[PDB]
Design an enzyme around this catalytic site. Sequence first.
Site, mmCIF file in Angstrom:
data_model
loop_
_atom_site.group_PDB
_atom_site.id
_atom_site.type_symbol
_atom_site.label_atom_id
_atom_site.label_comp_id
_atom_site.label_asym_id
_atom_site.label_seq_id
_atom_site.Cartn_x
_atom_site.Cartn_y
_atom_site.Cartn_z
ATOM 1 N N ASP B 8 0.828 -1.040 -0.077
ATOM 2 C CA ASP B 8 -0.316 -0.094 0.085
ATOM 3 C C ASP B 8 0.740 1.355 -0.081
ATOM 4 O OD1 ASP B 8 -2.268 1.590 0.593
ATOM 5 O OD2 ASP B 8 -1.577 1.965 2.453
ATOM 6 N N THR B 12 1.525 3.868 4.348
ATOM 7 C CA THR B 12 2.117 2.721 4.519
ATOM 8 C C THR B 12 3.936 2.917 4.226
ATOM 9 O OG1 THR B 12 0.265 1.194 4.070
ATOM 10 C CG2 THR B 12 2.624 0.252 3.977
ATOM 11 N N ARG B 39 -6.934 14.084 4.537
ATOM 12 C CA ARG B 39 -6.899 12.482 4.429
ATOM 13 C C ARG B 39 -8.163 11.915 4.462
ATOM 14 N NH1 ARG B 39 -4.967 8.612 1.860
ATOM 15 N NH2 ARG B 39 -4.409 6.711 3.199
ATOM 16 N N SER B 114 -1.942 0.936 -5.041
ATOM 17 C CA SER B 114 -2.532 1.976 -4.589
ATOM 18 C C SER B 114 -3.726 2.707 -5.241
ATOM 19 C CB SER B 114 -1.363 3.066 -4.519
ATOM 20 O OG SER B 114 -1.886 4.469 -3.949
ATOM 21 N N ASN B 115 -4.229 3.456 -4.424
ATOM 22 C CA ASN B 115 -5.740 4.216 -4.968
ATOM 23 C C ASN B 115 -5.097 5.353 -5.853
ATOM 24 O OD1 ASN B 115 -7.901 2.790 -3.837
ATOM 25 N ND2 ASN B 115 -7.340 3.930 -1.940
ATOM 26 N N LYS B 147 -9.979 1.012 -3.525
ATOM 27 C CA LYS B 147 -10.030 0.164 -2.378
ATOM 28 C C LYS B 147 -11.134 0.294 -1.676
ATOM 29 C CE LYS B 147 -5.019 -0.464 -2.199
ATOM 30 N NZ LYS B 147 -3.687 -0.053 -1.514
ATOM 31 N N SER B 171 0.222 -3.247 4.585
ATOM 32 C CA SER B 171 -0.620 -1.998 4.868
ATOM 33 C C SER B 171 -0.854 -1.561 6.150
ATOM 34 C CB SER B 171 -2.019 -2.260 3.803
ATOM 35 O OG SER B 171 -2.784 -0.783 3.949
ATOM 36 N N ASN B 173 -3.403 0.740 6.838
ATOM 37 C CA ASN B 173 -4.754 1.347 6.547
ATOM 38 C C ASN B 173 -5.588 -0.197 7.024
ATOM 39 O OD1 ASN B 173 -4.950 4.129 5.940
ATOM 40 N ND2 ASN B 173 -3.443 3.304 4.331
ATOM 41 N N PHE B 175 -8.909 -0.457 6.490
ATOM 42 C CA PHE B 175 -9.867 -1.034 5.381
ATOM 43 C C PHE B 175 -8.876 -1.434 4.322
ATOM 44 C CE2 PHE B 175 -8.644 1.795 1.861
ATOM 45 C CZ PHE B 175 -7.932 2.644 2.400
ATOM 46 N N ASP B 176 -7.860 -1.259 4.010
ATOM 47 C CA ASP B 176 -6.908 -1.866 2.901
ATOM 48 C C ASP B 176 -6.479 -3.141 3.374
ATOM 49 O OD1 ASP B 176 -5.656 -2.029 0.591
ATOM 50 O OD2 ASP B 176 -3.722 -1.202 1.337
HETATM 51 CL CL LIG Z 1 -5.252 5.835 -0.224
#
Ligand SMILES: [Cl-]
Lengths: 245, 245
Positions: B8, B12, B39, B114-115, B147, B171, B173, B175-176
Amino acid sequence: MIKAVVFDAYGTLFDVQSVADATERAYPGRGEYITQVWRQKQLEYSWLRALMGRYADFWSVTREALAYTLGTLGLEPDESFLADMAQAYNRLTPYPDAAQCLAELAPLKRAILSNGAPDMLQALVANAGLTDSFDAVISVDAKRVFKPHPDSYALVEEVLGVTPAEVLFVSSNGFDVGGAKNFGFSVARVARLSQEALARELVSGTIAPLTMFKALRMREETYAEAPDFVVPALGDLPRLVRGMA
Amino acid sequence: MIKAVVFDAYGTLFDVQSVADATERAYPGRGEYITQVWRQKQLEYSWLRALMGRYADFWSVTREALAYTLGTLGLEPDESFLADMAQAYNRLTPYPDAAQCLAELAPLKRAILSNGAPDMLQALVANAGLTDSFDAVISVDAKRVFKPHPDSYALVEEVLGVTPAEVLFVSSNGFDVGGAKNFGFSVARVARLSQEALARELVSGTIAPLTMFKALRMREETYAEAPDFVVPALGDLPRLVRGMA
Ligand SMILES: [Cl-]
Ligand SMILES: [Cl-]
């Protein structure tokens, strides 16, 4: 012509801050914090479960969000405790002008479209004594998605037999305003926090927690289509539909 | 066997807090606030746009989130200003031990998922001096989802040719981590904020807005499947992979 007025539930007809005394018991001194993070994470989890393709109804989402929130404080409540306390979301107090609004909106079709699970919405509506104010109380559960997924809004025509063009959708939640506009409804946003008040609040020295929730949740979202109408309260909707037609 | 370590990006490998000086210099007294909300809304908008079926790449998302954030403060900067300031996200400082970590993983395939939009990621990685540390830098943009939508993670096999079973996904995150686990990857979560420290911070008196972001973003999410491993730093990954399989 507007044939139906469909209401968002949580935050629109019902005050999510009204879990205040239940949360203050879960952790004295931290009721405000829990109230805000619980609601925020409840929303996040509905989006993330849906987007991930792992739907679970809003009752599971609500309990998971509560577990997360209390976890941040170092607590480890069991399922029994969580199921018990999460009931606070089925007792949310309706906004004081909801009943009158709904009464004056008759004979137009009146309904709720909500992320809430079927049993949640029924209990919530029953507790508030608003059962006979709605032609339908529609949960997204049938579609196994959460707002702002278009399938959630597709339910309105399925249940009420009115086209998106004949619906005035009402919501205080920016993401829901966006999802409803995206789908094709006319939308009346209920905006209870004046932008100018927030702006000055965020400048007044240290920034509080409820203020944080407000900054994140009480505005129009920049990616979303603008609502057709904005009013300060539910009680203004009857007048809006009149001067509208 | 693990054939690839997929990272990520935002949060990350790169510190999203490092836009602080730019947001602060741009608007004295409001930097910390802007950094957090920027963010938070950037993430929310990626989820909500995807869930609505109204994708726009992360560069549009990043600028929309900034516009929202500055808007809460009563500011209305033009598109030119937003595009210029948003460049801060293409210059995030890498975490101090990222370079060494990636180096000791040189035997395995090393990638980013990545997003971030294509051009964003290239600059982000190049400016961080980590371009030669990756065999692939993968953006979700090709799939036109964000994601944790499963299609985001499907890109890994398409680009690297390794199956989910052969991937270690890294990651910070929650959610990730959840999206990667749901898709079938092995996951190493990077947890830089100890749970016990957050708990005590949340009760150390008046709760600061910075702790708000931490409470919302730095923990495992309760709806998500647990990660296979949790390390406090990127530098611990090589050693984790050595004595893994
Ligand atoms: Cl992101
Ligand atoms: Cl909701």
